[PDB]
Design an enzyme around this catalytic site. Structure first.
Site, PDB file in Angstrom:
ATOM      1  CD  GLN A 198      40.640  36.314  39.663  1.00  0.00           C
ATOM      2  OE1 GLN A 198      40.444  35.075  39.595  1.00  0.00           O
ATOM      3  NE2 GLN A 198      39.777  37.191  39.217  1.00  0.00           N
TER       4      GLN A 198
ATOM      5  CG  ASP B 138      45.005  41.536  41.725  1.00  0.00           C
ATOM      6  OD1 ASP B 138      43.938  42.057  42.127  1.00  0.00           O
ATOM      7  OD2 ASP B 138      45.725  41.998  40.850  1.00  0.00           O
TER       8      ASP B 138
ATOM      9  CG  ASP C 208      46.290  38.730  50.636  1.00  0.00           C
ATOM     10  OD1 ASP C 208      46.491  39.773  51.328  1.00  0.00           O
ATOM     11  OD2 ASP C 208      46.338  37.584  51.126  1.00  0.00           O
TER      12      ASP C 208
ATOM     13  CB  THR D 139      45.548  44.429  54.576  1.00  0.00           C
ATOM     14  OG1 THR D 139      45.722  43.086  54.139  1.00  0.00           O
ATOM     15  CG2 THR D 139      44.327  44.575  55.597  1.00  0.00           C
TER      16      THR D 139
ATOM     17  CG  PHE E  16      50.730  44.258  55.545  1.00  0.00           C
ATOM     18  CD1 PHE E  16      52.052  44.639  55.462  1.00  0.00           C
ATOM     19  CD2 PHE E  16      49.831  45.120  56.184  1.00  0.00           C
ATOM     20  CE1 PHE E  16      52.494  45.839  56.018  1.00  0.00           C
ATOM     21  CE2 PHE E  16      50.268  46.307  56.764  1.00  0.00           C
ATOM     22  CZ  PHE E  16      51.602  46.677  56.655  1.00  0.00           C
TER      23      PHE E  16
ATOM     24  CG  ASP F 220      46.879  40.583  55.105  1.00  0.00           C
ATOM     25  OD1 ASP F 220      46.282  40.393  54.018  1.00  0.00           O
ATOM     26  OD2 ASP F 220      46.663  41.564  55.847  1.00  0.00           O
TER      27      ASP F 220
ATOM     28  CB  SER G  19      43.027  40.814  53.660  1.00  0.00           C
ATOM     29  OG  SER G  19      43.799  41.100  52.458  1.00  0.00           O
TER      30      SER G  19
ATOM     31  CD  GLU H 185      35.810  37.642  37.822  1.00  0.00           C
ATOM     32  OE1 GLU H 185      36.496  36.729  38.256  1.00  0.00           O
ATOM     33  OE2 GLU H 185      35.796  37.868  36.622  1.00  0.00           O
TER      34      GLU H 185
ATOM     35  CG  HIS I 221      43.004  40.946  33.146  1.00  0.00           C
ATOM     36  ND1 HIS I 221      42.633  42.251  33.340  1.00  0.00           N
ATOM     37  CD2 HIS I 221      42.718  40.292  34.302  1.00  0.00           C
ATOM     38  CE1 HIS I 221      42.175  42.386  34.576  1.00  0.00           C
ATOM     39  NE2 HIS I 221      42.119  41.187  35.171  1.00  0.00           N
TER      40      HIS I 221
HETATM   41  C1  HEM Z   1      38.455  34.637  35.038  1.00  0.00           C
HETATM   42  C2  HEM Z   1      39.439  35.437  35.401  1.00  0.00           C
HETATM   43  C3  HEM Z   1      39.330  36.935  35.649  1.00  0.00           C
HETATM   44  C4  HEM Z   1      38.251  37.743  35.623  1.00  0.00           C
HETATM   45  C5  HEM Z   1      36.833  37.263  35.247  1.00  0.00           C
HETATM   46  C6  HEM Z   1      38.709  39.021  36.045  1.00  0.00           C
HETATM   47  C7  HEM Z   1      37.937  40.153  36.108  1.00  0.00           C
HETATM   48  C8  HEM Z   1      38.370  41.378  36.642  1.00  0.00           C
HETATM   49  C9  HEM Z   1      37.506  42.528  36.763  1.00  0.00           C
HETATM   50  C10 HEM Z   1      36.007  42.673  36.452  1.00  0.00           C
HETATM   51  C11 HEM Z   1      38.232  43.495  37.315  1.00  0.00           C
HETATM   52  C12 HEM Z   1      37.666  44.851  37.658  1.00  0.00           C
HETATM   53  C13 HEM Z   1      38.220  45.723  36.557  1.00  0.00           C
HETATM   54  C14 HEM Z   1      37.966  47.213  36.707  1.00  0.00           C
HETATM   55  O1  HEM Z   1      36.829  47.673  36.862  1.00  0.00           O
HETATM   56  O2  HEM Z   1      38.913  48.049  36.598  1.00  0.00           O
HETATM   57  C15 HEM Z   1      39.540  42.987  37.494  1.00  0.00           C
HETATM   58  C16 HEM Z   1      40.571  43.656  38.107  1.00  0.00           C
HETATM   59  C17 HEM Z   1      41.806  43.083  38.443  1.00  0.00           C
HETATM   60  N1  HEM Z   1      42.328  41.953  37.921  1.00  0.00           N
HETATM   61 FE1  HEM Z   1      41.259  40.568  37.049  1.00  0.00          FE
HETATM   62  N2  HEM Z   1      40.053  39.023  36.205  1.00  0.00           N
HETATM   63  C18 HEM Z   1      40.443  37.705  36.198  1.00  0.00           C
HETATM   64  C19 HEM Z   1      41.753  37.244  36.331  1.00  0.00           C
HETATM   65  C20 HEM Z   1      42.811  37.977  36.882  1.00  0.00           C
HETATM   66  C21 HEM Z   1      44.076  37.441  37.130  1.00  0.00           C
HETATM   67  C22 HEM Z   1      44.591  36.014  36.816  1.00  0.00           C
HETATM   68  C23 HEM Z   1      44.833  38.420  37.714  1.00  0.00           C
HETATM   69  C24 HEM Z   1      46.245  38.311  38.159  1.00  0.00           C
HETATM   70  C25 HEM Z   1      47.130  37.359  37.975  1.00  0.00           C
HETATM   71  C26 HEM Z   1      44.014  39.589  37.850  1.00  0.00           C
HETATM   72  C27 HEM Z   1      44.398  40.758  38.424  1.00  0.00           C
HETATM   73  C28 HEM Z   1      43.510  41.805  38.575  1.00  0.00           C
HETATM   74  C29 HEM Z   1      43.871  43.010  39.271  1.00  0.00           C
HETATM   75  C30 HEM Z   1      45.092  43.396  39.947  1.00  0.00           C
HETATM   76  C31 HEM Z   1      42.851  43.787  39.250  1.00  0.00           C
HETATM   77  C32 HEM Z   1      42.827  45.124  39.970  1.00  0.00           C
HETATM   78  C33 HEM Z   1      42.220  44.932  41.428  1.00  0.00           C
HETATM   79  C34 HEM Z   1      41.988  46.287  42.184  1.00  0.00           C
HETATM   80  O3  HEM Z   1      42.971  46.873  42.758  1.00  0.00           O
HETATM   81  O4  HEM Z   1      40.889  46.869  42.200  1.00  0.00           O
HETATM   82  N3  HEM Z   1      42.862  39.317  37.227  1.00  0.00           N
HETATM   83  N4  HEM Z   1      39.646  41.733  36.973  1.00  0.00           N
HETATM   84 BR   LIG Z   2      37.456  40.671  39.933  1.00  0.00          BR
HETATM   85 CA   LIG Z   3      46.027  41.840  52.191  1.00  0.00          CA
END
Ligand code: HEM
Ligand SMILES: [Br-]
Ligand SMILES: [Ca+2]
Ligand SMILES: *[C@@H]1O[C@H](CO)[C@@H](O[C@@H]2O[C@H](CO)[C@@H](O)[C@H](O)[C@H]2NC(C)=O)[C@H](O)[C@H]1NC(C)=O
Ligand SMILES: *[C@@H]1O[C@H](CO)[C@@H](O)[C@H](O)[C@H]1NC(C)=O
Ligand SMILES: *[C@@H]1O[C@H](CO)[C@@H](O)[C@H](O)[C@H]1NC(C)=O
Ligand SMILES: *[C@@H]1O[C@H](CO)[C@@H](O)[C@H](O)[C@H]1NC(C)=O
Length: 595
Positions: free
Chosen positions: A105, A108, A110, A184, A186, A188, A190, A258, A351
């Site tokens: 997470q 992600d 970053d 960013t 990168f 990094d 951020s 969060e 997730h």
């Molecule tokens: C307790 C754990 C977690 C919660 C409560 C959580 C919750 C969220 C929520 C609310 C979103 C916004 C979803 C949307 O509106 O489309 C999100 C997006 C995201 N989640 Fe999670 N998540 C968690 C764990 C993780 C983990 C472990 C990863 C990766 C290993 C991850 C990767 C992401 C990614 C990539 C996004 C998209 C970010 C973006 O570009 O906007 N999540 N998640």
């Molecule tokens: Br989130």
């Molecule tokens: Ca970054």
């Protein structure tokens, strides 16, 4: 003609072309295309967007408009039928710790953030979506199917607002809608420093001239620092326990509070900064405000890179690591460093790795008090449990000693996230992250599952029999067919997560391709990649090698013992060495004899 470079959120930056530090914004990394990888630009499109009307409307917006001759199934019905399960017994990953999930997470965060549009907060169009469930403009509600129990307790829909897009909101026609990446591209840190000059300054201690990040004034952790509070009112963190009234934290990334273990990780990283700004200051008292801030940042940026590429990616990618992320050959200014829109759904494989509970363990790694193990849904936007219930040491112990959830085709997303998600600006622990992810795939114009299998040079099933073979799962395939009717229509997030895992990996072949490729690019297209010649000194680079997540913990917590390999499953005391044998970061090689 054509798009030819659009964007509203680009402004007032002059590249100092020989500077030794990254911009906060990511601008200037690539000297021939200075905006590549910068925050507040469109996510990259590896394949053309697919919208219901060609330009902007998501598949599923208009009831009579099919995708490939079929209606797309409701995201919630997909969630209920495929993604859910009741029994947490036997779901845990026997060879990944919880820290494996949480690092995912961090990484992600970053790399990407596509934030929701605000069409009318300061209006009740935003509670016209909530309260009335009326689709329109940026409101795209997740409608409940017929036998959903949320019908009986929650109304007709879960509200959902469409992601922001470049050249900003809400009119956008002539070319296809491109969603913003607000951080960013990168790797990094951020998430620690911000991706915007304004935030990056507010986060800093601009009273002492010592290159520090602002710490909590109100509260400390047996002396150790908490992140400062955001004095946004309304804080959703205050809302979840108005008696305790403890606000959300303020970090580089807006999503830091969060969930309590994200908040906890952010805490560790900030500490590691302000700590680095102290030890550099003793090592070089000549050094001024920025010098200390930039040199610490630069170190922490490298730490993220090393743990991610050395420790994290080989155990997600398994046997596919080499195929996508060969040994680093150097900075290649021809490589596109931008995050792709599809990566932002690919990396949501995490997730499926989140378990239903979180534990606080004491100094013997035993249950810290009577409420030691908490349901995950109580810990969304929860800072009060860190502050008025033990600090971060016990949560970090849980992180190391407990396990991630294992992805399972029959048990995909715990009910803590699938039924009990809390959204800010919403009252209820009653949202569905899986459904939300599916709605979002559509929001962002994702190509279907077979276009991505095509992209990655994998077979494209057309039949029930084909899908059963690809998924190696008759029942799961039949359920996808009944809902989607063609594998071409399967949303990428569910599609890629349904595939069996590669050997030694935690993702299937399609995801390993999507993920692997993006991370290759992250490294090769980064001028400030930690091992590119001249970013650090050879001396500093052999020191950076030493770094471990174990050492991070030893330094910024009152924990005395930790495992050697913090990402795999580790059992106490059998796998726990003492903080003394965890190799420290040697900081001598930064000592400068320069007035
Ligand atoms: C307790 C754990 C977690 C919660 C409560 C959580 C919750 C969220 C929520 C609310 C979103 C916004 C979803 C949307 O509106 O489309 C999100 C997006 C995201 N989640 Fe999670 N998540 C968690 C764990 C993780 C983990 C472990 C990863 C990766 C290993 C991850 C990767 C992401 C990614 C990539 C996004 C998209 C970010 C973006 O570009 O906007 N999540 N998640
Ligand atoms: Br989130
Ligand atoms: Ca970054
Ligand atoms: C900036 O850092 C300095 C520490 O160097 C902080 O100033 C201290 O804060 C408290 C008063 O609240 C007292 O310990 C001292 O009077 C101050 N210390 C020094 C060395 O002068 C200041 O709080 C920091 N600010 C933030 C936001 O982190
Ligand atoms: C746990 O996984 C790692 C791969 O990260 C591997 O080195 C180790 O063999 C695994 N251990 C067991 C006992 O499965
Ligand atoms: C809120 O916090 C108070 C004080 O920390 C605590 O005693 C109580 O358990 C919490 N209540 C709820 C409903 O979360
Ligand atoms: C990457 O760099 C190599 C070597 O300079 C170059 O041949 C290639 O065209 C570049 N593009 C990629 C990432 O394949």
């Amino acid at each position: 003609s054509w798009e030819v470079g659009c964007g509203a959120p680009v402004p007032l930056v002059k590249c100092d072309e020989n500077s030794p530090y990254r911009t906060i914004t990511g601008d200037c990394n690539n000297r021939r295309s200075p905006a590549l990888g910068a925050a507040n630009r469109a996510l990259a499109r590896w394949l053309p967007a697919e919208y219901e009307d060609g330009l902007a409307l998501p598949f599923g917006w208009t009831q009579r408009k099919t995708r490939n001759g079929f209606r797309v199934p409701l995201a919630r019905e997909v969630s209920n039928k495929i993604v859910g399960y009741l029994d947490e017994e036997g779901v845990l990953d026997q060879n990944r710790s919880l820290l494996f999930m949480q690092w995912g997470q961090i990484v992600d965060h970053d790399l990407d953030f596509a934030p929701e549009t605000e069409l009318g907060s300061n209006e009740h169009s935003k509670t016209q979506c909530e309260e009335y469930c009326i689709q329109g403009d940026n409101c795209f509600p997740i409608m409940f199917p017929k036998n959903d129990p949320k019908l009986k307790t929650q109304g007709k829909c879960m509200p959902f607002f469409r992601a922001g897009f470049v050249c900003p909101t809400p009119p956008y026609q002539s070319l296809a809608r491109e969603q913003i990446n607000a951080v960013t591209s990168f790797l990094d840190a951020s998430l620690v420093y911000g991706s915007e000059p304004s935030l990056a300054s507010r986060l800093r201690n601009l009273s002492s001239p010592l290159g520090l990040m602002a710490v909590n004034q109100e509260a400390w952790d047996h002396g150790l620092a908490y992140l400062p509070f955001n004095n946004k009112k309304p804080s959703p963190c205050e809302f979840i326990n108005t008696t305790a009234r403890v606000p959300c934290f303020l970090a580089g990334d807006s999503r830091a509070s969060e969930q309590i273990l994200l908040a906890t990780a952010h805490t560790l990283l900030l500490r590691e900064h302000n700590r680095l700004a102290r030890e550099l200051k003793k090592l070089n008292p000549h050094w001024n405000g920025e010098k200390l801030y930039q040199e610490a940042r630069k170190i922490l940026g490298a730490f993220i890179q090393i743990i991610t590429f050395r420790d994290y990616l080989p155990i997600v990618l398994g046997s596919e690591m080499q195929k996508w992320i060969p040994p680093y050959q150097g900075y290649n200014n021809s490589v596109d460093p931008r995050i792709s829109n599809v990566f932002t759904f690919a990396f949501r494989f995490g997730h499926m790795e989140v378990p239903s509970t979180v534990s606080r363990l004491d100094e013997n790694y035993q249950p810290w008090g009577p409420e030691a193990e908490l349901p995950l849904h109580t810990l969304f936007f929860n800072t009060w449990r860190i502050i008025k219930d033990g600090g971060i040491d016990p949560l970090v112990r849980g992180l190391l000693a407990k396990k991630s959830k294992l992805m399972n085709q029959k048990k995909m997303v715990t009910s803590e996230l699938r039924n009990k998600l809390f959204q800010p600006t919403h009252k209820i622990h009653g949202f569905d992250l899986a459904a939300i992810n599916l709605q979002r795939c559509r929001d962002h114009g994702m190509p279907g599952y077979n276009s991505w299998r095509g992209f990655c040079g994998l077979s494209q099933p057309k039949t029930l029999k084909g899908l059963q073979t690809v998924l190696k799962n008759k029942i799961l395939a039949k359920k996808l067919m009944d809902l989607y009717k063609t594998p071409d229509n399967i949303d990428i997030w569910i599609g890629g997560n349904a595939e069996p895992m590669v050997e030694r990996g935690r993702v299937g072949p399609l995801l390993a391709c999507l993920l692997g490729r993006q991370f290759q690019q992250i490294r090769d297209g980064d001028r400030f990649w930690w091992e590119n010649p001249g970013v650090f000194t050879e001396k500093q680079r052999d020191s950076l090698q030493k770094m471990s997540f174990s050492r991070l913990i030893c330094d910024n917590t009152h924990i005395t013992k930790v495992p050697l390999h913090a990402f795999q499953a580790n059992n106490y005391p059998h796998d726990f060495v003492d903080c003394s044998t965890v190799d420290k970061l040697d900081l001598s090689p930064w000592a400068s004899r320069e007035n």
